[PDB]
Amino acid sequence: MKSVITTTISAADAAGRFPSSSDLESIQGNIQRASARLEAAEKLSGNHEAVVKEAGDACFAKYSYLKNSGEAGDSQEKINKCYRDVDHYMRLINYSLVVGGTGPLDEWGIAGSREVYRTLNLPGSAYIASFTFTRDRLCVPRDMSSQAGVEFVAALDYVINSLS
């Protein structure tokens, strides 16, 4: 699970040395950017339900054909799997946002996704519609602090650029 401290410990471990001052500066930067990350994590755990609700609502506001032909989530159950999947996604954005690297988001969500969305006839463009709605909606000084909003946007963009 990739973070600042796991990269530097794993790198010095691959080296075969005790941690020099470089790793110490890296973890110093971890404890500098920490406050903005954890603020974003607090607000995400605050309103996750309304975020996922707006995400799925806009995702079917864009693409109506998922419902139209039994070739997508046309049964209330499949749309419940839809909002569940976006729940998983915001949960992984919260986890990578706490860790501060893209580690848990990559290994739990992104790694091996392509076989799953490919095999199970799941379109990625609809996911991207959901995330880009939750991305376009955000205001930096309206709710989140500027530094935390940046962190949030960055992580969500990572999800988009890892998806398609």
Partner 1 sequence: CTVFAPTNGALSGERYDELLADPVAARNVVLRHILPDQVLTSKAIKGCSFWDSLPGGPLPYEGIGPVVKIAGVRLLNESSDDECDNGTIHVIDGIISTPLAKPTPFAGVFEPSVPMLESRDDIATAVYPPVTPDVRRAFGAASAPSTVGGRKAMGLIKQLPFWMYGPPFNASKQEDFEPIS
Partner 2 sequence: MLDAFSRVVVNSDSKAAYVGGSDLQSLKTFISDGNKRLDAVNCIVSNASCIVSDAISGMICENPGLIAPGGNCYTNRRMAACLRDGEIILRYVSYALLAGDSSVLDDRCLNGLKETYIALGVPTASTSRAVSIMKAASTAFIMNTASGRKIEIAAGDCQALQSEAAAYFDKVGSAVD
Binding site for partner 1 (CB under 8 A): 46-47, 50, 58, 61-62, 133, 136-137, 143
Q: How far apart are the first and last CA of the chain?
A: 22
Q: Single out the residue of 63, 67, 85, 95 in contact with partner 2 (rule: CB under 8 A).
A: 95
- Output the CA torsion sign for 19, 24, 25, 27: positive
- Binding segment for partner 2 (CB under 8 A), chosen from 23-31, 67-75, 76-84, 112-120, is 23-31
Examine residue 47 and tell whether it contacts partner 2 (CB under 8 A).
Answer: no
Gap between the Cα atoms of 134 and 58, Å rounded: 9
**Given the complex with partner 1, which of 106 and 152 has the nearer CB atom?**
152
* Buried/exposed code over 141-160 (b: 16+ C-beta within 10 A; e: otherwise): eeebeeebbebbbebbebbe
Residue numbers at the binding site for ligand PEB (CB under 6 A): 21, 24-25, 28, 33, 43-44, 46-47, 50-51, 54, 59, 66, 72-73, 78, 81-82, 85-86, 88-89, 108-109, 116, 120, 122-123, 126-127, 130, 137-139, 142-147
Q: Which is nearer to partner 2, 59 or 128 (CB)?
A: 128
Tokens of 27: 């973890």
- What DSSP element (H or E) covers 27? helix 21-46
Cβ contact 129:32 at 8 Å: no
User: According to CB under 8 A, which one of 60, 72, 142, 152 is a site residue for partner 2?
Assistant: 142
110 binds partner 2 (CB under 8 A): no
